[PDB]
Amino acid sequence: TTITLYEHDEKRYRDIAGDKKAIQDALIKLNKQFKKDFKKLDRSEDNSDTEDTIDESKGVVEVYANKIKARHYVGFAAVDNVFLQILPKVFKPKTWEPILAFIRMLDMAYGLKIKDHDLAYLQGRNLRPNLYEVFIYLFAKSLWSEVQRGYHREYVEVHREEKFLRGKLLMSRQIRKLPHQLNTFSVEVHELIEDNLLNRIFYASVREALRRTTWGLNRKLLGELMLAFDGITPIHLRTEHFERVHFTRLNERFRRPFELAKLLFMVSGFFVDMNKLFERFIERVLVRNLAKYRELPSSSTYNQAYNMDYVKTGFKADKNFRRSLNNII
Amino acid sequence: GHNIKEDYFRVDMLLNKKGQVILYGPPGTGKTWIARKYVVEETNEKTPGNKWEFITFHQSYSYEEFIEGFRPRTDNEEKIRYVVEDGIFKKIALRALVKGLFELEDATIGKDKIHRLYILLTKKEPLSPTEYEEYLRLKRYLWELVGGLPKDKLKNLTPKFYLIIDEINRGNISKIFGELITLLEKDKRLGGENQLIVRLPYSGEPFAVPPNLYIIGTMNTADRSIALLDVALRRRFAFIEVEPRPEFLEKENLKKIREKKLKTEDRKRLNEKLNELFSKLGNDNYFLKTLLEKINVRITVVKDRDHRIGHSYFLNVETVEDLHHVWYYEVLPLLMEYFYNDWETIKWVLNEKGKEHGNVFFEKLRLTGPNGEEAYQLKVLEGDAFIGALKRIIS
Amino acid sequence: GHNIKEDYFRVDMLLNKKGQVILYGPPGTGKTWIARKYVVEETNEKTPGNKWEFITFHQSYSYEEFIEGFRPRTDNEEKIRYVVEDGIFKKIALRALVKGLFELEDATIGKDKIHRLYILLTKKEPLSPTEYEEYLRLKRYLWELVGGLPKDKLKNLTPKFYLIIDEINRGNISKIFGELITLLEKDKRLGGENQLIVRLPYSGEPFAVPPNLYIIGTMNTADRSIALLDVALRRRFAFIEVEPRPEFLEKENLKKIREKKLKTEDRKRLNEKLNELFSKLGNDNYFLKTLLEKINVRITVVKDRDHRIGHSYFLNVETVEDLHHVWYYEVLPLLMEYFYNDWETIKWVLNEKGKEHGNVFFEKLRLTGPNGEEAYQLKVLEGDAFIGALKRIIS
Amino acid sequence: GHNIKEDYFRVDMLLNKKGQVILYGPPGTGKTWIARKYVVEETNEKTPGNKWEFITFHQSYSYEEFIEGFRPRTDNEEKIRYVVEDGIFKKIALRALVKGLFELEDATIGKDKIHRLYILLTKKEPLSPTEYEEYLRLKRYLWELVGGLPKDKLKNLTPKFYLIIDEINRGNISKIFGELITLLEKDKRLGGENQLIVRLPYSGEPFAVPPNLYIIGTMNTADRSIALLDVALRRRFAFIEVEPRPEFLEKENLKKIREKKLKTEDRKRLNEKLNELFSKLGNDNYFLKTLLEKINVRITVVKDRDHRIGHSYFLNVETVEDLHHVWYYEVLPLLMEYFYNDWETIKWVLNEKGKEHGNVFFEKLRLTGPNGEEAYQLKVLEGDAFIGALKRIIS
Amino acid sequence: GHNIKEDYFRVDMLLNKKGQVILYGPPGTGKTWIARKYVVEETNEKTPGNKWEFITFHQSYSYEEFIEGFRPRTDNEEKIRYVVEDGIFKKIALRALVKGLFELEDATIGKDKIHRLYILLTKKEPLSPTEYEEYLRLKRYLWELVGGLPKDKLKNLTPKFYLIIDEINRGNISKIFGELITLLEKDKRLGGENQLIVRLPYSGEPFAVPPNLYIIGTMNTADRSIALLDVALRRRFAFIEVEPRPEFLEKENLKKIREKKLKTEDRKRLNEKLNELFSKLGNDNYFLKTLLEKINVRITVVKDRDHRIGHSYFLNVETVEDLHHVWYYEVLPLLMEYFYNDWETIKWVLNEKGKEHGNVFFEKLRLTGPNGEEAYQLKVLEGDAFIGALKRIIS
Ligand SMILES: Nc1nc2c(ncn2[C@@H]2O[C@H](COP(=O)(O)OP(=O)(O)OP(O)(O)=S)[C@@H](O)[C@H]2O)c(=O)[nH]1
Ligand SMILES: Nc1nc2c(ncn2[C@@H]2O[C@H](COP(=O)(O)OP(=O)(O)OP(O)(O)=S)[C@@H](O)[C@H]2O)c(=O)[nH]1
Ligand SMILES: Nc1nc2c(ncn2[C@@H]2O[C@H](COP(=O)(O)OP(=O)(O)OP(O)(O)=S)[C@@H](O)[C@H]2O)c(=O)[nH]1
Ligand SMILES: Nc1nc2c(ncn2[C@@H]2O[C@H](COP(=O)(O)OP(=O)(O)O)[C@@H](O)[C@H]2O)c(=O)[nH]1
Ligand SMILES: [Mg+2]
Ligand SMILES: [Mg+2]
Ligand SMILES: [Mg+2]
Ligand SMILES: [Mg+2]
């Protein structure tokens, strides 16, 4: 059951065509999982203090016996056949325009490099509006564009007993061989291997993505990524795995799929507070045109003190702020 | 035999243009069979070794087994020695050049040295150290003669030689084709307009591909991603798509293939079984044609065209239990492999998407997990249940 | 029971169809036992050696152990010499071909140099340097005879030889088989349509796989799935799911399984203990049938079919402390290994989720970590509280 | 012209200014062709071996076969002998240096020892163990000779030597060029402003690159995994971009390229074949020019500029059937590797976006998936339907 | 009792069931001590050499030092001869077979040849070249004798032999055992149902594992667990978890462990050190028991059970300064490598999460980072502050 919510919207269980309890206790195991991961989640005067506040069904959503009221935490959530997404109510209309505004919000504020032509490709594909399947697509398209541009291979120094002399003959190991051991060479080789730790992360991210994706567009994109990572060893994606990748000239072109693979993989789903999503927004806005999130710098749209207009639903919004910058400066 | 003499014609015309072709397509389309039958037709030799060779690339296959490498050999007193053994491409490229230098009626080719080099290239036991040094000496004479020989005679090397590289995408082709990225191109061969003689690292010897050597590769395009080939290496080969041909799976076309190699008293005994098989399929002579076309279009929509099911599995089907074998051991494991056990996608390919717990190929388990997970299980249907489920795919 | 006629027929149908088969399944399903018993029944040889051989694939398994490699040997003056010796596959394939040509009534076959090659191929003692040089001159005579023999005689060579490869998924198939994984195909075999006389790298000897030779792979799938195999192993081999059979663990089925070799005074002694075993289980003869199928169904919805619990652990259970040792040191170590300490999935497989600090197999530790981490302790229940939680699994 | 003189002139100017160039670009743009054409015109030698060498880098090139390394050699008095053998670069650099000291007029230079070292460097046979010690002796004589030579003498070494390294990015270049990252700089060569002489690890011998030696690399830019991203190594080379030139595919430019190898009446045979070809393209002499330039700027937008189709795909067409075989077997399978299962983009490259049926290269399959996904079938056009679908691309 | 007699019963049960066992667990639980003292309890031999052997596996341990391999040897007049020298597994298996047949009463046994072979298998020195010929003569006689004896008399060989392989997971089992890991199965031993007598690759004698030879491995599971072991070890070997037992660290149980290793002149000096150790530790005799078990439960919550602290750290502790030196130089260096740069976990393990300053092992630094990063500082407590910090962990 896919739940599409804005912040502080309430839809009852009778409103969503699903089950009366399977929609409940799925995300109950997520907002308690959000209570477990609450200390690493960043807040900027959001006034939560959830040491025991989120334990009383007050995590990313309110689990009432009648309805589900959403909170300021925006993002997607996939648990136990129940998909949930919470969007900013700034972008709430009077069906794809609110989601891509939320993509381009955390593209230019959270520091990602989400291309606009990849978001323009999803429009007109008559798909269902889904935060998870958009980020599954953006990970899988950026990974498939990179693997097509070149398969990631690393050089590793291997000391092998080889039946053909490849690379550098290890002389002190070959000299100290008894004469019944002279049917192989002790060599040092620097070989282009494909089973890297970066490719093992990308393989286990494509495996976890087909386990939960529902678009045929993403499934076809991830299936050809699955055949690309065929000879790669399957791993389990720990947080220990994602920190052993260090980005140099060899693999910095695989950084855009990696920051998307880290955003999805590490009950799972990304959530940022919209209070601090607006904090990191305007500090990247005030510095190139030259923070309370309630209705009453604040946000201004067709549904919603310097007001910030939103033409980002589909860069001339900051030109209207010059009339506000003429008084502020 | 009208359709075999045009797939021969695609291979024959493009081998004259590019020097080397790749037959690509899904597994089971007859790519290894077309490549082998073209070469036994062109080179009138049923066995590899003289004017053609058969090699299969695998993940562990290397440049050193293909071109040359330092290799531990033994003496005639079986003491170990490290020599540079020529690989299978270099042994047949030198064979194609030296046999091509036989028929050249030139007054500068030392035919006694060239025929002795041919014997050491066609010797199949490993060379004695007293004839390995003769083999290095005659190769040293060969590239001395070839380098001072004009393109008018080097481009007309008459006996064509062939190298079938089966499963060529299963190896790291750029690593295995070390100098062969440059050398295989038709301009870069001997007698070519931009003829290139390379120096090989291990032996230190000159090397070039002769023009009468041809390489037919076969690529199963569902066993390795075709978007992982090198674009520059792709420029060397003509790429011939060998697609599944379910028109071979009609009753008259099944008879026209299986009666080219067996006797007449076995022919109509095979024909009465094919008439017995197709009678149980609703007396539809185009049943296996329609069954393979319907699942391959359904595969092409939700997967690649490269992951289609080939026609060669159903080609030796003459009973219902032969069709029951091919479906449950060549089709259904192959569909589960291609779709990574996505039961909802396979059941749409098998035209049974909103249909479980019945006469289906994938029954749903009645138990659900704690996370709401549903599992599907392959159901073996026999008799009228199997034929009625194959008719559900067509309908 | 009809287990060893139903799995016998499925192997025998697939061995004369594909040429080679892989018995895949979860561990403890009798895959190696089915592979060994079918082969012993098909050869009337209880031990490996002449008509069959048994090997295990590991990650360090090589081409040289399997096909061909240089072995260090001594001299008369005890210096190291290097003999190229035949691996286990080259020995079983040459033994299958020589026994195939010895029974083949033909006039071109010498039948005394062939029978002498059969002695040197079955010789368990290592060959003398005058026998090994004789062994090489007979394999020269053999392969020039097989190359001269037509396809009509090499179609059906009568005695059937078997190579059981235990844990075939552990070995690197590209390094072990090499190029010769393609000779396993039914048409590429020695007498088929597209047959291949390949030359071997070390001794330059002709080699081909006869139709006598059948490969019965055995493969655990809980450690490595079929999708994680080499693509050459998926294409050439047929695959049989050796399913875990809880119907063996019925009280009368458990009696007749152990009585196939037991003392005839020990039948009433098993009827002493197996009747007192199932009396403590609640006089339900289908207890261990229901217990293994309630476990394996709950595995299949939360994981693969590959990770089910096999029936072989419960076969030698005659008392409740034998059932306690099998549950706590074979079954629960398998469940904790499969689920990677995800105890709430293991507790749902035993349907004890939401049930902690009691007579459970996994009690909760009452300490919550600094990041909310929770752990579970493997509680070791004994006696009637062990059955009281084991009865709760099937309820 | 820009290629008749000027692309030659870019190589000659940047090879004297920098000492080594790398010709980079898409496949089939003429990087290997102009590298071979320049060096054959400079050295007046059609074949390598003297005054120029041709090598191709790959993943089994090493430092040990390029500069120097312990390579095992075998004699008759000794079985296994590990010997530091100089690689192909150390052979071509010492050959350039020794030949440069032939024509120097110093009385310090012992001409008999230098001429003897040239024989042992240009020896086609491998070095005898009594000649390898003479070779090690004359090398250590030379490196103390040029160490005491004035740098005004050492920099004008007269006969230029050329190492063409085709596919230079296919090897681990910094691993291959071990000491050469230092030594290949133009003022760090012999007689340079900051002349450097390194110490080599295996032979323990001094080494420097002469100013007499030039490197012409040809690297491919379509593969970004082997992209030359070593910022310090890039400083040593001039990077000449060889772009796809669609203006070669004009009718008046096609004949004057293709008739430079044709002598008397095959030019007339080529002329009326190109007259017949371009009359069937609507009398557009710039048809294939517009076909390449419209496809390549469409490839440049959706994929990189390094994935442009080189003009060598279309440079050998003479009929509309040659264009048809270049399209359907070389160009269109390449675009299907570029835009793999990405049908809306490859239809935009072929200017048929939104045209689902008709005389179109990719016909839409009428079936849609369960999730609404869609596939396109490759339609093989022929005749004016093929030429009319090619006119849709160019306009 | 609970350390020996209860734990030996688990070893006696599984070693007489599986034939080989691996004692696994975290370090310091006594796996090597239990394996040594059990085997001395069974063989009645304190020093190895006759009825048992001790080795440690490592990564340079191989086949030639374990079973057999060629070795150079001066046999006569300093002319070295390459002979097969038996490794420790072949020697302990032949020693178990010979002593099993010396105490057998078949009367076709040649006891004078059998007992002389037992002398040659127990020589502490390398064998004479005269004795090496007799050793090969009697090994030849032994394997004709074993090959003639029935299977049922080879079943119950009387004296049990042992091979303690410490750190069994540290050597690669595929290259150490070779193909002989399958001979360790109960049925595949010398007398079982599927009894296999293999040949050895270098010497060619027969070899089989006798049933009275047992393998006791000890294995650390803190580095890599049972689920990531070699697949040859996980099925051939039985597995006993040697867990940390903090009940040894009770005051009465710390006396009884250490009073056995001392004379009675130094027994009473240790009871006046442990009475004055648990007088500073409050007066609780279960302090170090509760200190280990409160920490070890907290390790299972965050990491796993495999990373628990063994009792052997606190087992030689006689004073508070002994407990202080165990803490700051063994325990906390291990816990800071368990939770590296992870401060709130290790403060939760030490029951001090929240308590930031004073009487803690980790004092909070007074500086908050730019991103809110917070670091701690290892505070060395000496005296009653150290005891009160330890007794905060136990409370
Ligand atoms: N009588 C009888 N014994 C069986 C049966 N199935 C398994 N066993 C016994 O169980 C033991 C283990 O069976 P085995 O052949 O090793 O299964 P496996 O699938 O190969 O197990 P693994 O190697 O993956 S761990 C064998 O010794 C065999 O005798 C059966 O159906 N009948
Ligand atoms: N006359 C002429 N021929 C050219 C020109 N460019 C390419 N060719 C022809 O096309 C063929 C391919 O050119 P080539 O040099 O081999 O491409 P490349 O740059 O090396 O492409 P790559 O796949 O190896 S990476 C050459 O043999 C040459 O005959 C050119 O500018 N003038
Ligand atoms: N009396 C007694 N001493 C023990 C016991 N366990 C460990 N020890 C003592 O502590 C020492 C360490 O035990 P040891 O056997 O080496 O631990 P381990 O399990 O092998 O640790 P590792 O080798 O994996 S690091 C032993 O030498 C022994 O003296 C025990 O249970 N009883
Ligand atoms: N006679 C005939 N046999 C075919 C044809 N296509 C496939 N086969 C047979 O099918 C079998 C397997 O086909 P194969 O070539 O190995 O499939 P591929 O290599 O994956 O394309 C071979 O033994 C062929 O003999 C065909 O068109 N005609
Ligand atoms: Mg094939
Ligand atoms: Mg097995
Ligand atoms: Mg090139
Ligand atoms: Mg130990």
TrEMBL record, chain A:
- Pfam families assigned: McrBC
- Sorted alphabetically, which PANTHER family does this protein's record hold? PROTEIN MCRC (PTHR38733), TYPE IV METHYL-DIRECTED RESTRICTION ENZYME ECOKMCRBC (PTHR38733:SF1)
Which species is this record about? Thermococcus gammatolerans (strain DSM 15229 / JCM 11827 / EJ3)
Protein name as annotated: McrBC 5-methylcytosine restriction system component
Instruction: Kindly list the organism's lineage.
Output: Archaea, Methanobacteriati, Methanobacteriota, Thermococci, Thermococcales
- Which superkingdom? Archaea
Q: Please give the InterPro entries that the UniProt record associates with this protein.
A: McrC (IPR019292)
UniProtKB/TrEMBL annotation, chains B, C, D, E:
Keyword 4Fe-4S (UniProt):
no
- Annotated keywords: Endonuclease, Hydrolase, Metal-binding, Nuclease
* All residue ranges annotated as the AAA+ ATPase domain in the record: 17-247
Keyword flag Nuclease:
yes
- Write out the residues that bind GDP 1: G28, T29, G30, K31, T32, W33, D187, H311
Question: One GO molecular function term?
Answer: endonuclease activity
List ligand-binding residues for GDP 2: G28, T29, K31, T32, W33
UniProt binding sites for Mg(2+): T32, D166, E167
Locate the transmembrane regions by residue number: none
Protein name per UniProt: GTPase subunit of restriction endonuclease
Q: Which organism is it from?
A: Thermococcus gammatolerans (strain DSM 15229 / JCM 11827 / EJ3)
Full protein: residues contained: 191 to 585 of 613
